[PDB]
């Protein structure tokens, strides 16, 4: 089965920790695994004013929120993927599993 | 015909069909990314959402 695991979150260190955990689990389970594909980061910007009224010098805010995405490939049946993804998941990391 | 006189005006677009989801105001909305909030409430609640000032 050509199963794919997509890993996305806000922070980068928890995503890297859970991704390295998945890679080292697939390595210790004696199974071939492709490397993590580093997707380009999506940047979400809203530039809004600072004064609630219309008085003062025109000063703007620059809010920003970066989103990272990873791609993980395996060559195993479904129960191996569930038993490797159902143990020790980060609280801030969102995971989605897709199969073809 | 008071019931059908009450809604002879269809408000399906324009500034009056959209309101902030916090303070119910119809000025300075943020329609980006499906936020649908005014600028002041977005600045008030922008820390918990995830929008932080870096640049």
């Amino acid at each position: 089965h050509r199963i794919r695991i997509t890993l996305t979150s806000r922070n980068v260190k928890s995503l890297e920790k859970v991704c390295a955990d998945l890679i080292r689990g697939a390595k210790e389970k004696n199974l071939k695994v492709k490397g993590p594909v580093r997707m380009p980061t999506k940047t979400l910007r809203i530039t809004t004013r600072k004064t609630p009224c219309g008085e003062g010098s025109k000063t703007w805010d620059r809010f920003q929120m970066r989103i990272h995405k990873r791609l993980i490939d395996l060559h195993s049946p479904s129960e191996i993927v569930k038993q490797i993804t159902s143990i020790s998941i980060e609280p801030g990391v969102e995971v989605e599993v897709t199969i073809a | 015909g008071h019931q059908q006189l009450y809604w002879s005006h269809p408000r399906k677009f324009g500034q009056g069909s959209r309101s902030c989801r916090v303070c119910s105001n119809r000025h300075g909305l943020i329609r980006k990314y499906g936020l649908n909030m005014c600028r002041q409430c977005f600045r008030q609640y922008a820390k918990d959402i995830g929008f932080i000032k870096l640049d």
Partner: peptide, 19 residues
């Protein structure tokens, strides 16, 4: 599902739900 909103909109809705 049949809606499947985008990855940016999902995180925005999660932040709105948290707020």
């Amino acid at each position: 599902m049949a809606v499947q909103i985008s990855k940016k909109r999902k995180f925005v809705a999660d932040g709105i739900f948290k707020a």
